[PDB]
Structures are given as structure tokens and as C-alpha cells.
Amino acid sequence: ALTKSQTDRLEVLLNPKDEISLNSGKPFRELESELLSRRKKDLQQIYAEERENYLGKLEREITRFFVDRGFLEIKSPILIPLEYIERMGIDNDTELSKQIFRVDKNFCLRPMLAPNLANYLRKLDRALPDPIKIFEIGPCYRKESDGKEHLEEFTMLAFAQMGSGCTRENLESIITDFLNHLGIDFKIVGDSCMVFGDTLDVMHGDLELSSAVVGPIPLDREWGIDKPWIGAGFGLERLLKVKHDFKNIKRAARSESYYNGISTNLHH
Amino acid sequence: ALTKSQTDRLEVLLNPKDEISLNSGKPFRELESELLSRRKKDLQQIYAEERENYLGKLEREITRFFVDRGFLEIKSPILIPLEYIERMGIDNDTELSKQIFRVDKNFCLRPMLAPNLANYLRKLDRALPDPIKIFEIGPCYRKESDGKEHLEEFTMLAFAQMGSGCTRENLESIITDFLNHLGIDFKIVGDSCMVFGDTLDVMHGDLELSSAVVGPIPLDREWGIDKPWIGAGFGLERLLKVKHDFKNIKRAARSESYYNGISTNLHH
Ligand SMILES: Nc1ncnc2c1ncn2[C@@H]1O[C@H](COP(=O)(O)OP(=O)(O)NP(=O)(O)O)[C@@H](O)[C@H]1O
Ligand SMILES: Nc1ncnc2c1ncn2[C@@H]1O[C@H](COP(=O)(O)OP(=O)(O)NP(=O)(O)O)[C@@H](O)[C@H]1O
Ligand SMILES: [Cl-]
Ligand SMILES: [Cl-]
Ligand SMILES: [Mg+2]
Ligand SMILES: [Mg+2]
Ligand SMILES: [Mg+2]
Ligand SMILES: [Mg+2]
């Protein structure tokens, strides 16, 4: 019989590979010591043989994927004008506007990559040939209720193509090649969101891995875009959660409490 | 005779490779058109042959360097408790405390990597053998007066070693191998800052590339560290500025106005 505090403690030390039961007869200290030893050996092995962080490693693999397929790598500001949020159609008093991390009077931490990538599409239209293909990977921020699938600080991949080839079939083809490369099974379901209209949601079971959009849409005019486009946004921590079978997305996050899904709190 | 507005416009279109003079007899529109054509061909070439962003590429090269030399790659939160800033000795009413980007009541955008890496050193001490070596690359935030060497949103590399081998000689040796790898000449000068005490500042001419610290220092006790350590922090945008000979650090920043030092504003 373990307390909730004892059960929580063993939960954070448990890893998906473990075949260890908390409802066995073994006392708490005996269970904690064995798990502590396992998590120490896991960090030791990483320290000796790999030393790469899962979230950084995935970013590098995704970067290579899209660069090799003709997409320009973008690194745009994380801190952006609050006015970009308005021009996306996210008015005040809308439920999405209350997820915005505001900074000073006129800036915020970006909740999405779309505004910056939209400016890059319009600007790069003066220089690059058809089609224009870009992508960015970086931090995004949303105030969220507590949940095993949501983080307030997460990492988004967003890619976009503008010009020729911007069909639903091509968008699904890119998504399929991308998730085939990561080795992640998925299905596509139609849904609607209140920024882009109807989207294609990329589902792993009931977990949304991505929302993809087939342009053009009326919002394009507010950004100086008048060509067809296709795009999608993926959550890297959600990709890692599925890939490594984490029960809670905190295991995949920028964190001081977990490293590659291994608890960093290895005290007794 | 060009106006200040005309001169500013040609300045942003000029690249360090260009051998073009603004005080020649050529009219403004003729100068702008030639530079616009050059910057279009530069983006075209990147789009066709490389497609990597300088800031992301440098991050990948630095990551590989430190991983190959036994340092564990860390990805920690960018949004951190305001209380971490206090425990670094940055009290209110101190000049450094007015550079902090505050978020909500109790959080801020990290102005440095030291607090998070200090927690990782203490936690990893329970698991990893001697010496413990870690590093992180990621965004940091400081309110700054306008200047050609400062950004409000920049990218910091910080590495640390804890345990044996934590001498000034070894710290300088790592710095030398690191900047030799990037191909950057530098000198080391003694200076003092009001968080760590005396530091070793890594200078490229008059531009500070890094501040390095030989522990132990009295601040260590506030973080649960009681072993010797050595560490340094580098600005990636400053490394790129020196490497590519940018006159203004805006050329090396996360930006919607420059890509790999090339203006994205290619209108007339
Ligand atoms: N708070 C979050 N934490 C982690 N990943 C997130 C978060 N919000 C969005 N993402 C990811 O980013 C992708 C694109 O953003 P978006 O489509 O706006 O999110 P979303 O539809 O609100 N997902 P959800 O909040 O679960 O209904 C999503 O499909 C997720 O994979
Ligand atoms: N505002 C900034 N913009 C760009 N790089 C910066 C900025 N602040 C610090 N850095 C870089 O981060 C390194 C480590 O941080 P730190 O030593 O605290 O900066 P610093 O001593 O205040 N440099 P400086 O403001 O020029 O006197 C510096 O050596 C710089 O290379
Ligand atoms: Cl997005
Ligand atoms: Cl630092
Ligand atoms: Mg949501
Ligand atoms: Mg969605
Ligand atoms: Mg300073
Ligand atoms: Mg300094």
C-alpha cells in the first residue's frame, strides 16, 4: 500500500521500457532504489555513447529532411509583435487570444510560426523561383490548462510551399514522406479551426500531431500573399512522445526535471 | 548626393563582399537596382545549393564539436523563474536586473544559461562519473540600448565542466580548440563582472566573444554546487559577425529583415 506521494515518485522514475509493477509486494524504498539505479545507468550510457538530447536530435533530423527536399531553413524571431496576432484573425476576447504570453506592451512570445513564415513567403517571392518552399523549427508559447498532451513551452515545425504544386494531394504526400521518415503511423481527419478555416489534422490515434492547411484562404490578403500555398505545423514534443511512448508530454519537453525522458531528480 | 534615407537603403543592400562605392557618380536608382540584383542572385544560390540558415548551421557545428568532446547536450527552458535571477545575485535595483524580460508575475525570458546549467550540474552529480561536462545552445534575452554589437534576442552557447580538470589552463585550452575549430582569432583579457567576480573575457579585437569563469565561487552554495568547475558563455551572433565580417549584428540575428546577412526587403 503506497501513498499517492509514493506512487507519484515511482511514476516519474518509471520508464516505458521498464517491466516493473507498483502493485507488487515490494516495499517503496526497494522499488525506488531499483528504479534510481536503472535511471542512473541510462544517463551513464547516454553520457558514454551518444550525449545527444532527443529534442535537439529530432530538430536536426527534421532539418536535414526538409533541406534535402528543397525547403529553405528559416530562423525567425520568437518574440514578435502583438499586432501579428491580430492580423492572423485572433482578436481580443477570442479564446485563442487568452493563450498568448504577452511581453511588454506590444510584443508576445509567438504561439505559432505562421505569421513569420507568411512574411518570408511574401518577401522571398521577389527573389526565388517557383515553387517557394520554406520551413522553420523553433520554440512557441501558449498558455494551456494542465494536460498530458500540452506544454506551455513547446517546439513547432512548420513548412510551407507557395506557387505551383500546392494541392491537397501534394500536401498529404509531403506529410506521408515526412512521417514515414520518422517511422510514425498516422491518419488524416478533416477538422476546422478558427484561424485557417478547415484543416487536415494529422492524428496518431486520438493525439493531434499536426494541422495542415490548403490555401489560398481569405486571411492571405492581410499578409500580402496572393498565390496558392500549402503548409502544416507539427509539434516536436508530440512526435517524441509517440516515438518513445511517453505517457506524459513533460518527458519530451525542454526541462530541468527530465532528460531524454529520464528523471533528473535522482535523490532518495 | 544621396539623402540619409537613400544612404541607409543602400547600406542594408550592401554586403561585405561587395566592392561597390556609394560616393561614386552613379545615381541612387542605378545603385539600388544593381544591389537588388546581387542580393537576389545570392538568395537564389542559397536556395539552389545549400538552403541552411547561418545561425542554425553554426548551432549544428558547435553541437557536434562539444558532443564529440564528451559534453552532454542540454535543452532547458527558455522561460524560467524570476527567482533564478535573484539567486544568481542579480537583486532588484541592480543595473542587470533592468535588462530582464519579465513574463507574468514570477517568470522571465532567461538572460543567461548559467542558472539552468547549474541545476543540471547538481542533478547530474548523482549519476554521471567525473568529470561532468555539459553544454547548451539556445535563445537568451536582454533589454539593451541600440548598438551594432547587441541584440535583445540572441543565441548563447554555454559549456561547463565540474570535478577534476577544472583549471584556468584547461578552460583556455577548450576555448582555444573551440575557436580554432571555427577559425576565429582571439585574445584573452582579464576582467570582472558583478555576478561571477573576475572572468576571462575572450576578445576579437574590441568585441567580446565570451566571458569564461574559473570556479569555485561563493555563488556556488546558492545552487548546491560544492565542487570546482569551469565554464564559458559565447554569443553565436557575435561569432557569425566576426566570421562573416558583418558590420552590424542585426545581419546575424533571428530576423525577418535579413537571411544569412542578405536583406529580405528587396522592393524598390
Ligand atoms: N500546447 C502545446 N503543446 C505541445 N504541442 C502543441 C501545443 N499546441 C500545439 N502543439 C502542436 O503544434 C501543432 C500545430 O499547432 P495547432 O494546430 O494550432 O495546435 P492545436 O490545434 O491547438 N492542438 P490542440 O491544442 O491539441 O487541439 C499541433 O498539432 C500540436 O502538435
Ligand atoms: N545583447 C547581446 N547580444 C548579443 N550577444 C550577447 C548579448 N549579451 C551577451 N551576449 C553574448 O553572450 C556572451 C556571454 O554573456 P555576458 O558575458 O553576460 O555578456 P556581456 O559581458 O554583458 N557582453 P557585453 O554586453 O557586450 O559587455 C557575451 O560575451 C556575448 O558574446
Ligand atoms: Cl503555425
Ligand atoms: Cl551564461
Ligand atoms: Mg490548442
Ligand atoms: Mg491544430
Ligand atoms: Mg551586457
Ligand atoms: Mg561578459
Curated annotation (Swiss-Prot), chains A, B:
The keyword Nucleotide-binding applies. It is found in: Cytoplasm. Keywords: Aminoacyl-tRNA synthetase, ATP-binding, Cytoplasm, Ligase, Nucleotide-binding, Protein biosynthesis. GO terms for cellular component: cytoplasm. Catalyzes the attachment of pyrrolysine to tRNA(Pyl). Pyrrolysine is a lysine derivative encoded by the termination codon UAG. Belongs to the class-II aminoacyl-tRNA synthetase family. This is Pyrrolysine--tRNA ligase. The gene is pylS. The chain holds residues 189 to 454 of 454 of the full protein.
